[PDB]
Amino acid sequence: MSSKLNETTEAIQRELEETTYQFKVQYNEQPMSAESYLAASLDDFKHQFH
Amino acid sequence: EFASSFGRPQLQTLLKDALDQKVLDQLAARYWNRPIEDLSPAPREPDNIIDLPKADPDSPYWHRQLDTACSGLTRLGVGRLAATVAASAIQQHVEKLLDKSSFAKHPSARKVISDAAATVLADRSYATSDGIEISLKPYKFDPDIQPNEWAQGREHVVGVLQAELEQCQAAMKALENSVGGRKKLKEVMSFVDKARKGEIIVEGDHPSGAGGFSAALLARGREAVFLRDRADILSLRIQAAKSRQCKTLTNKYYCPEVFLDAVATKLAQTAVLFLNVEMLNDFYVRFPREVEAKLHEHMHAGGGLEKFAREDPKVRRHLDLIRRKELLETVLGKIEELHRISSG
Amino acid sequence: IIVEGDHPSGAGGFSAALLARGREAVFLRDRADILSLRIQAAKSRQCKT
C-alpha cells in the first residue's frame, strides 16, 4: 500500500488539477451555493411582481 | 540597440495576430458550417447565417450566440498565450541577433547564450501570465467597445476574414491536386451535393462503396464541399462586414466579426502593456547578468576558453605565431645565463 | 497504369462497377470498329471473286 502511495497520490492530483481548471474555464471559478442562486431568482421575481 | 528597438509595438502586433487565430476558431465553431456526412442535412434552419442582416434584433438565438462566443474568447488562457508567444518571439529575435552577432562561430558559446535567454523567459513566464489574467479580469466581465475601436475592428476584420478566404481557397486547390483531376473532385462534389438535396438518396447497407466512388474519395469530397460552403459563408460575411449596417456598433449582435476582433485587440493591447513592463523589462535586466554568469561558468569551469580561441581561424594564427618566438627566447636566456657563468 | 477495384457502385470517382462497365464499353467499341471494317472488307472488290 505504501509503495502504491506515491503513484496513487499523484494520480489523484492529476484528476484534481483537471477539475480545478474546468472550474476555471467553466464559470470562471465563481462560487455558488444553491441558496445564492434561489436568492437571486427570488429577488428578481419579487421586483417583477410588485 | 535591439532593446531600444523592440519595445512594445512589436508585442502589440504579435499578440494581436495570435488572438486573430483565436477569433477565427471561435467564429467558426459557433456560427458557420461543419464537416459533412451522407444523410441529407438539417435545415438547420433558424441558424442560417444568410438572414443575419434581416433577423430580429431581439433574437434569443443570436443573442446567446455572440455572448457565449465572447465570454469564451475571454475565458481562454490569453495570459499563457501572451507569455509563450512573447517567449518564442524574444527567443527568436535573440537567436537572429546572435546570427548577425560576433558569435556566429563558436557554437558552444552561442548555445550558452541562447539557453540563458530561454531560462530567464521560462522564469518570468508564469508571473507574467497570472498578472495578465488579473489585469484582464475587468474586461472579462464587460469588454465594452468604443466606436473608435469598433472602426479599428472593422478594418482589421476585413483583412483577417479575406485572408482566411484565400486560405480556404488554397486548401481546396491542394484537395483537388490531391484527389487528381479537378474534374473528378467536381464529380464527387456533384455526388455529395445531390445527396445533400432531395435529388438522390443512398441507404447505408455497404459502407465500402457508395456511388462509383471509394470510401475515402467520398470522405475527401464531403470535406471538399465543406471547404467550398465555408468559402461561400466567408465571402458573404466579408460583404456584410463591409456593409453599411455594420458601420455603427449599436448592432453588435448583427456583426460578430468586428465585435470579436475589437475584443481581441483590446485584450491584446492591455495584455501587451503588462507583458511589456513585467516580462520584457525583466528580460532586459536579467538577461545580461545571466549571459555573463553562464559564460563565466562555462569558460572557467570548462576550460573551453582556450578552445574558444581555437575556434576562430584568424586569432588562432595570431596566438600560434607567438609560441615559437617563446621557445627561442627561453633558449637564448639559458645561453645568456651560461655566458654569464663563463665570464664572471 | 493499372487500377484497383475498391468501389463497385455507380455515381462518385472511378467505381469498380463503373470500371467494369467501361471495360464492356471499350469491348463493344472495338467489336463495332472491327465489324464495320469487316463489312467494308466484304464489300471490297478483293472479295468479289
B45 touches B302 (CB < 8 A): no
CA nearest to B22, candidates B314, B296, B264, B243: B264
Sign of CA pseudo-dihedral B107, B108, B109, B113: positive
For residue A33, the 8-state DSSP code is: -
Backbone angles phi, psi at C21, to 5 degrees: -65, -25
Q: Could you give the CA distance from residue B255 to residue B181 in angstroms, rounded to a whole number?
A: 39
Q: Could you give the CA distance from residue B7 to residue B14 in angstroms, rounded to a whole number?
A: 12
H or E stretch including B121?
helix B107-141
Within 8 A by CB and 6+ apart from C2, the residues are none
Among B184, B200, B208, the residue with its CB nearest the CB of C13 is B184
**Which residue out of B26, B73, B74, B75 would a mutagenesis test of the A interface target, given it has the greatest number of A Cβ atoms within 10 Å?**
B75
Q: Which chain B positions have a beta carbon within 8 Å of A25's beta carbon?
A: 75
Q: Which chain B positions have a beta carbon within 8 Å of A28's beta carbon?
A: 75, 140
User: In chain C, at which residue ranges do the beta strands (DSSP E only) sit?
Assistant: none
Q: Which chains touch B (3 or more CB pairs under 8 A)?
A: A, C
3-state SS class at C44: coil
User: Which amino acid, residue B170?
Assistant: A
7-46 in C: which are within 8 Å (CB) of B?
A: 7-19
Give the cell for residue C45. Answer: 472488290
Q: Does C12 sit within 8 Å of B191, measured CB to CB?
A: yes
B276 touches B8 (CB < 8 A): yes
3-state SS class at B210: strand
B132 touches B74 (CB < 8 A): no
Q: Could you give the CA distance from residue B322 to residue B111 in angstroms, rounded to a whole number?
A: 30
Taking the mean position of all CA atoms in its chain, how far away is CA B46? 35
Q: Could you give the CA distance from residue B22 to residue B73 in angstroms, rounded to a whole number?
A: 7
> Residue-wise over B262-273: b if at least 16 C-beta within 10 A, else e?
bbbbbbbbbbbe
CA nearest to B73, candidates B28, B39, B14, B105: B28
- Å from A42 to nearest chain B CA? 23
H or E stretch including B118?
helix B107-141
CB pairs under 8 A between A and B: 3
Dihedral of the CA atoms A6, A9, A15, A21 (nearest 10)? -100
3-state SS class at A26: coil
Backbone angles phi, psi at B178, to 5 degrees: -70, -45
B129 touches B82 (CB < 8 A): yes
Taking the Cβ of residue A1 and every Cβ of chain B, the question of whether any pair is shorter than 8 Å is answered with no
- Å from C33 to nearest chain B CA? 28
B115 touches B290 (CB < 8 A): no
Q: Could you give the CA distance from residue B307 to residue B313 in angstroms, rounded to a whole number?
A: 11
Give the cell for residue C14. Answer: 472511378
Q: Does C6 sit within 8 Å of B212, measured CB to CB?
A: no
Q: Does B187 sit within 8 Å of C7, measured CB to CB?
A: no
Within 8 A by CB and 6+ apart from B159, the residues are none
Within 8 A by CB and 6+ apart from B104, the residues are B98, B110
CA triple B191-B197-B198, angle to 5 deg: 105
Give the cell for residue C7. Answer: 468501389
CA distances from B309 to A8, B68, B111, B306 (A): 54, 61, 16, 5
Q: Burial, B285: exposed, middle or buried (Cβ in 10 Å; 0-12, 13-18, 19+)?
A: exposed
Q: Does B206 sit within 8 Å of C13, measured CB to CB?
A: no
Backbone angles phi, psi at B213, to 5 degrees: -120, 145
Within 8 A by CB and 6+ apart from A17, the residues are none
Q: How many residues does chain C have?
A: 49
B261 touches B20 (CB < 8 A): yes
- Å from B8 to nearest chain C CA? 54
- Å from A30 to nearest chain B CA? 12
